[PDB]
């Protein structure tokens, strides 16, 4: 009956399929459409826009080209020149706005309406420092991959000032990815202890390379820094000696989520992930889980709201969206268990702050649960790991 | 953790650990989680009257603050200082600031203890009354930051950037010499204070109080107390 | 309102934020867009209707780098501003592998100027080489 | 198999008895570490 239009923004693929995340939004309107029991009167339509994702220009028209239409919320890029331009349109009109991806918050940019459904980077790094620490290292290497890098793990650079770790920041060659030259100067450098920061394409290829020069043996240890690690296929380095931790927000154990994967691999039908890349076939990556949130997040919100109607804010002779006040609060003050886990906002910057890691290893039956991080407590470990005899009642060499 | 009980006379609620809403006289027993809080004015730059007893014909540790035209805060907890605190102790001073600035200026203060040679058979005493803290005052044990002289004052805070006292500083201002409690020729050991303070107004929210602590006899800053710790607890518990 | 009128150089909107909206703007539309302070080049942000007049950080961190090496350094310590102030320093931050220093980086707390809990940590850690990257401003207030 | 077991590496030598390790594609294995030694009895120096 009520019409209720979100927008949209994505990756302009002129050939192929459209890309995961577009996907994902495509797949969670439809979800939430053919289901009554969440939102009885909506009947949300979408207006996804493809810009070159790469034009912070060409990212202001699609949302000024979706909010003259009429829109409630814009899901946003995936870029951080995009995302900072079209904040700023959303800021201005009224409208909320969506992220899914992680964005260089700038300090002094004085902005409400905006949430970050990825799980910001200062919360992860923490997950790092106490990971690191669990294993007791003293010679970590961090490998990054754009200088970017630098600002997501910078609470992993700022501690050998507290603690003993010594780092030894190392980067990944642009214009290629043959990383032979610098994993040379690592397996010489006796760095046995090494953090990457990739995504998840990146962390596969390393790791070819990695094999190819006998590096990845029973004395080495990678912590990988993405969200998608169950996506790679490690069949070649099961029986291999390395070990590979890494963090996994994606619920996989609970069923209701573990279905939705089992449809989403089905209704891609897309273009086939050839073994050169390295990845395994169907599976949701953690860049198209968070915008299946991102569609919920905002349908809670719009459930506690009904009012509401759309508008045809134009952006030049601009005014504030009157519903644009009222309807940032619900999402703000909103929770979701997703795919993710639960989705709970922070009450400052629309930041994910509090969420729910699952550690996952690499041991010879492939990755595998090894524990649980969250924010308010540590590293709950030692769920996988059982025994630490410790039997002192020994060595019987002098009474007095 | 050294052995310690304190009257804090906080200026800044600290919600988090147990402070309540308003400013408060407090009560500590190794916690900087009060056993016993009531309502303080919290006047501006104004002086200090305080008073802290506690007699074991009644056994309760009492401690009164009272500025000139204003009301007392009794803040009586009866506790049992047989077992809480150790023999041999060192009372002295302690004040400091965190984010928040203010003046934790004390001008005079005293002590007396009497305690039971043989209940009628002439009790000891450790009666001093420093009203004239000097600029080289040797019988103070001054740590952190803390900060004596240039006029009759005891600076508990580094000081002279107007009255505006350069935040997250603390200072304490333990007494020379030691006094005995436990109980061991029973604990009547009637500890007076007089503790005439000055908190001047920096237009600041004047925040982060002073105490009056009995600690253990070797005592430093605790790992850092700019701060909700107030200048002599390690932890938040 | 300016392309509208017509100009022939747009000159700076000098941060971050402001730059990468008129930069856009200006390669879709033609005009040179002349930055005048140092932003973050995005590696994939294929633009070029832009100078940008600030010398570069990929310059400067190897001067820094090269008075490390001239002064025979080798407990290094970074005191930056923002979380951006990684990036003007990449060369410093990523050589203690081709060299023996050891970088311990740190950072100013926002919203203040107070490096009363910063410098109290610098003197425990007996840190006595420590590399700024302030203004000017929060340089002397430092220093202070 | 022994790849695959992080088994060549630069501790270990191999030494194969087959006079055919030439027709080995050693690709994967050219910048591992590992050692391998082997005859060769095929004269290929010859350009006849
Ligand atoms: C969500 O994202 C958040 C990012 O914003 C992040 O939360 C942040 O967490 C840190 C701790 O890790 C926290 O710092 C604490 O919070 C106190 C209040 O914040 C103040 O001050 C900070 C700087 O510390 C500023 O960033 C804030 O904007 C706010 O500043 C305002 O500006 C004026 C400027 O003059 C200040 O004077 C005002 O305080 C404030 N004005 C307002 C709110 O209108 C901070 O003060 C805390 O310090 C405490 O300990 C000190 C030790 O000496 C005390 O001196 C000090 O006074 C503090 O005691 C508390 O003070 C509070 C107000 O300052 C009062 O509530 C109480 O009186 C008192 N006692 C209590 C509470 O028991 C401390 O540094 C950041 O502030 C916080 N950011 C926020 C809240 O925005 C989270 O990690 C993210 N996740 C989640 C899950 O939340
Ligand atoms: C990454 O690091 C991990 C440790 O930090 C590695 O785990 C080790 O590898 C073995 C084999 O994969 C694991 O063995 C499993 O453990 C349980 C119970 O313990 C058994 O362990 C002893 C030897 O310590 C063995 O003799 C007994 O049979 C016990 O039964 C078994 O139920 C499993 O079936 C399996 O055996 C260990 O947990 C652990 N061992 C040691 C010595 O650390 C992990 O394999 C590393 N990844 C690699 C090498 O690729
Ligand atoms: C199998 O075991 C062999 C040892 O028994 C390994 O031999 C090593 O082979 C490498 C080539 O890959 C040699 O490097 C050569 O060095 C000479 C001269 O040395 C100088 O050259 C480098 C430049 O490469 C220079 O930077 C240094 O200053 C050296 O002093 C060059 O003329 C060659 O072109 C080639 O570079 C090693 O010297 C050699 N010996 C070692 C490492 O002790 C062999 O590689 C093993 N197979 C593997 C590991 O797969
Ligand atoms: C439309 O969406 C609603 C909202 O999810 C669906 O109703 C409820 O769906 C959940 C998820 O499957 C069911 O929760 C179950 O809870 C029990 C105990 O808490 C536990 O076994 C699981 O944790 C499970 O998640 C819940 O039973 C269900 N409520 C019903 C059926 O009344 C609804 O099914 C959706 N519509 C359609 C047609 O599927
Ligand atoms: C790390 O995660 C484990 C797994 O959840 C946590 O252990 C759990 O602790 C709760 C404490 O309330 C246990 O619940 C209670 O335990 C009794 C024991 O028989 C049980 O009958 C009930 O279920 C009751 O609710 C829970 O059983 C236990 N789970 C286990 C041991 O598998 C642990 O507390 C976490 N550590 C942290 C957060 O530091
Ligand atoms: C849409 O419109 C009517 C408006 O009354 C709906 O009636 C209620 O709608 C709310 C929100 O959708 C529900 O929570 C109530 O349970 C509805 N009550 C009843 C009695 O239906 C109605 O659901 C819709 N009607 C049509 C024709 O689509
Ligand atoms: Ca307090
Ligand atoms: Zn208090």
Known sequence: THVLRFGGIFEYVESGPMGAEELAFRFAVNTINRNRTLLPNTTLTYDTQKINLYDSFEASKKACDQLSLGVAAIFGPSHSSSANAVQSICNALGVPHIQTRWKHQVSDNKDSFYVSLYPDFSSLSRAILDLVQFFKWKTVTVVYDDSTGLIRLQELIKAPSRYNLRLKIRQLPADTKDAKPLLKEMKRGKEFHVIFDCSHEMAAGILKQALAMGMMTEYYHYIFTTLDLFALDVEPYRYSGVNMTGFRILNTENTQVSSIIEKWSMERLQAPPKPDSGLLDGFMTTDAALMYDAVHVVSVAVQQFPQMTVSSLQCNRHKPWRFGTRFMSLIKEAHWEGLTGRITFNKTNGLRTDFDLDVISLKEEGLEKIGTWDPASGLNMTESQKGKPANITDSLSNRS | ?237
């Open chain 2, 1 to 237: 953790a050294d052995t310690i009980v304190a009257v804090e006379l906080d200026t800044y609620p600290n919600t988090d650990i147990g402070d309540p809403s308003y400013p408060h006289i407090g009560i500590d027993i190794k916690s900087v989680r009060s056993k016993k809080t009531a309502k303080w004015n919290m006047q501006n730059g104004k002086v200090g009257t305080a008073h802290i007893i506690y007699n074991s014909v009644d056994k309760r540790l009492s401690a009164v603050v009272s500025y000139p035209n204003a009301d007392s805060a009794t803040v009586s907890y009866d506790v049992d200082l047989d077992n809480v605190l150790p023999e041999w102790v060192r009372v002295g001073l302690s004040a400091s600031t965190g984010l928040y600035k203010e003046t934790n200026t004390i001008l005079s203060w005293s002590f007396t203890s009497k305690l039971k040679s043989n209940s009628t058979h002439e009790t000891n005493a450790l009666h001093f009354m420093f009203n004239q803290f000097s600029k080289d005052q040797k019988d103070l044990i001054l740590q952190g930051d803390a900060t004596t002289g240039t006029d009759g004052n005891l600076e508990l805070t580094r000081v002279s950037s107007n009255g505006s006292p350069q935040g997250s500083s603390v200072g304490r201002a333990l007494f020379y010499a030691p006094v005995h409690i436990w109980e061991s020729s029973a604990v009547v050991a009637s500890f007076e204070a007089t503790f005439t303070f000055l908190i001047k107004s920096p237009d600041s929210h004047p925040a982060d109080g002073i105490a009056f602590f009995i600690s253990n006899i070797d005592s430093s800053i605790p790992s850092g107390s700019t701060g909700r710790l107030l200048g002599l607890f390690p932890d938040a518990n």
